[PDB]
Ligand binder design. Structure first.
Ligand SMILES: O=C(O)CCc1ccc2c(c1)OCO2
Ligand SMILES: O=C(O)CCc1ccc2c(c1)OCO2
Lengths: 276, 290
């Protein structure tokens, strides 16, 4: 017997096999299942993913909330999801995701050791294992991730290609505060001096994107100047790469990524770059 | 179903996209898709897997043949693996199989090794002890085959028992929606476990090789007298055998995992006859349990 699903209401499932059965049942009725994996504590960046998922004709939206101890406002999160018209939240316990504990895992390729994988060398194994499981549980047609975590997005693309997964990955543009700051739950930690300084990440990247008519070095130099104009911004990296995070080709499309510490708070941003 | 599919005949697809589209199309029309993943060099052990799949009602059977480079260590192990692909296809036609899936290395690994499966701790033991990347290669290629074909059920022999347990771990741990079917080991008339590696036994080695299955079935009956008696019986028979060098003989809990043996065990052996490494294993019930 398939668990109950009430059309047009928020249906909350914590049991994997439950959301699995409901997903499979809804797909046979001709809904297209869209998955938005989150860690909860939802903000406007998450809502962009949801809104993107909602506009696919026939879409039913699955938002997973799961703190992967391997890589929270429960009532508020659920309220926001209800306000967006989301029909399924999948909120499993750690024991339900890991009934046998840690055992078989995904091992990313060597991109997972670079950039963010510098200070967290196991972070992406954690993410890809949990995302592979969510994919196999919900079996969506499309899965939605933000460009805000660009390297995560590229690694998912690699998971999907390498394991021949039959889902479309959709990257959704970063949502930004009015001065450019990339939305993040970390932003709440910044004191006002840090918060005013934090705008340099996005200012650097937009400057670089426009300096880029003058070539790669002028884009990187402009970004670096803008960062160098901000106090208490400890840049961990500022790197121009190709779209898939290999090395930047001589001309063509790229991505510039930055990360920095402000006090104890780590911030990331990235942007598309066209060279020349 | 996007490529041509002729039912009642053997359809051969090399392209992953081709088998994937045809499998999907079949399942959508109600057929249940059975996967039998092999490395070719098909013998009667593999035909039991096919037959077990054929007898699932409304089944369409996909046999994959692919000698997976990632499960072989360096050396000439990969080059030395038997490849008999004309016999293999003749056997599949004779068994009434409708789909053979025969991918190229380029189609399966277009980007070389990148994202891979890392097995749990069981993969470092037994066969995996001196072959520490062996089971990673197996679970990786099995994952990809399951994703390409998306079968309802997947079939493996009990012969490579540690492999079968690791497959069931892969399936549970990644929440894969396939059912894993273990099929009993097919044996020659004297007890010798069927294996593509039997062809490398000369006449003396072939005669001596009966010791493995004789040791195991001797232990299975001795086991009413306890674990030590089961083990000592197996050991005696192995010790009486000319030119059999034992690599391990171990009595484990059924899941081979971090649990002590109780009532149900699995007794596993690996031994070398010249350069040929043979495996066998058997169910063991200790004391009361039979
Ligand atoms: O909270 C974070 O740092 C990561 C989540 C996130 C943030 C902003 C986004 C997004 C996803 O997709 C649109 O813009
Ligand atoms: O050739 C090998 O060594 C592995 C394949 C195999 C062997 C014996 C079998 C079987 C599958 O399924 C039933 O008995």
């Amino acid at each position: 017997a398939i668990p109950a699903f009430h059309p047009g209401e928020l249906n909350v499932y914590s049991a994997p096999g439950d959301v699995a059965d409901v997903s499979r049942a809804l797909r046979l009725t001709g809904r297209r299942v869209m998955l938005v994996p989150t860690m909860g504590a939802l903000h406007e960046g998450h809502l962009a993913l949801v809104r993107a998922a909602k506009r696919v004709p026939g879409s039913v939206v699955v938002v997973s909330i799961f703190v992967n101890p391997m890589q929270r406002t429960p009532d508020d999160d659920l309220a926001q999801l209800r306000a967006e018209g989301v029909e399924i939240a999948f909120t499993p316990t750690t024991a339900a995701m890991y009934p046998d504990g840690l055992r078989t895992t995904v091992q990313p390729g060597p991109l997972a050791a670079e950039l963010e994988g510098g200070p967290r060398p196991t972070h992406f194994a954690g993410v890809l294992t949990v995302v592979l499981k969510l994919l196999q549980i919900v079996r969506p047609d499309r899965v939605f991730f933000g460009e805000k975590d660009y390297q995560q997005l590229v690694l998912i693309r690699q998971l999907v290609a390498d394991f021949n997964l039959d889902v479309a990955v959709v990257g959704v543009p970063t949502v930004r505060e009015a001065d450019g700051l990339a939305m993040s739950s970390r932003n709440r930690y910044l004191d006002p001096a840090q918060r005013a300084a934090a705008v340099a990440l996005s200012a650097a990247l937009t400057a670089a994107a426009h300096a880029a008519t003058a070539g790669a070095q002028a884009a990187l130099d402009a970004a670096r100047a803008v960062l160098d104009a901000a106090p208490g911004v400890a840049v961990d990296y500022l790197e121009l790469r190709d779209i898939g995070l290999g090395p930047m080709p001589l001309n063509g499309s790229g991505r510039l990524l930055v990360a920095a510490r402000l006090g104890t708070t780590r911030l990331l941003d990235n942007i598309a770059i066209e060279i020349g």
